[PDB]
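cache lookup: miss for this entity combination. No prior model stored, computing from scratch. Input as submitted by user K.M.:
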Amino acid sequence: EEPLPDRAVPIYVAGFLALYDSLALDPDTVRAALPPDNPLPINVDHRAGCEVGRVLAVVDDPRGPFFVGLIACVQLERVLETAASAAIFERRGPPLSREERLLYLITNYLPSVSLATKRLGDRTLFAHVALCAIGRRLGTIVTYDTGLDAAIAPFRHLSPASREGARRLAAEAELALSGRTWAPGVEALTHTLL
Amino acid sequence: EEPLPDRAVPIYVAGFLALYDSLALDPDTVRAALPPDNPLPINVDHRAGCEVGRVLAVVDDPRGPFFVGLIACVQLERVLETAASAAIFERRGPPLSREERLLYLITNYLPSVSLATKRLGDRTLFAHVALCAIGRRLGTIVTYDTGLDAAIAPFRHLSPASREGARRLAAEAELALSGRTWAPGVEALTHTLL
């Protein structure tokens, strides 16, 4: 089809991976695996082959484990566009630019995330974060944005200490991923999603 | 199944029905049909039988026609719950209450709306507002909330004059609908959605 864009639109995702009781995840086991030994990848529908990003930071918070991630995948943008073309387009207004079209699509088609942990039997308890396709899996709500601070801003309930640690941990982690894209495959993503 | 709740959770929806060029809808034709002669109903996927609410107010704005609506439908809440049970539930945390469960579901499953107009050939140009099922139709993004002011608040781009006219027009229109629910039918909604 049309030619793949040369650079991926960087997408930042933020949200709570879990919420504490006011029982599977309690604050004590979360702190045991608080700093992940290995970087937690971001995939689609828990399929390791469909890796589209990387978790930038996970911070403990009184509400629950809060995370920030970076998604850099031209092929995910193309596949979501293909799904959008399979639906009746009734949006009234001027065409959105490349960045807000991607935000419009990934928020509606991948509205939640799911945290994967190792089996029950600092620590390696955290495994990966999965983008959940709507109508397939229902996880915790996230926000998508083209800015790091912008992705965290709508979460007013986060304590200022957790917010600060998140954006400083995410900034230094984003730096190690300088100029890194993800290419799981257009057909690989289409099979999982559509 | 489980018994239908006796009272519907009132849901308020807000957003832009269309956006002006910086060509189908220009500001001049919008003002011609600015005050609808008849109340614009809210339905699902443009099917008149699946009426679930009522548009409370439509205000002209430099960005575009902005609307506020009320959705009061126990059966829509039940059907969306049935769709949620058909997906893998992976949300980590305590169970959401009845109100935020409904908000969680209607935002993810019905993320956009579409404005219906009469054919091309104050005025009756505006017909109804349709809740668009994700993966079926793609319309303009809306916000859902359990409060009238809360539904309008995230739209910071709205001019303060349009915001004021919207909440005063919506408040008096909501009053005429005192204690009115919508019952399109559980099977009617299931056929359209699932």
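stored under new cache key. Residues 107 and 144 of chain A are 6 Å apart (CA to CA).
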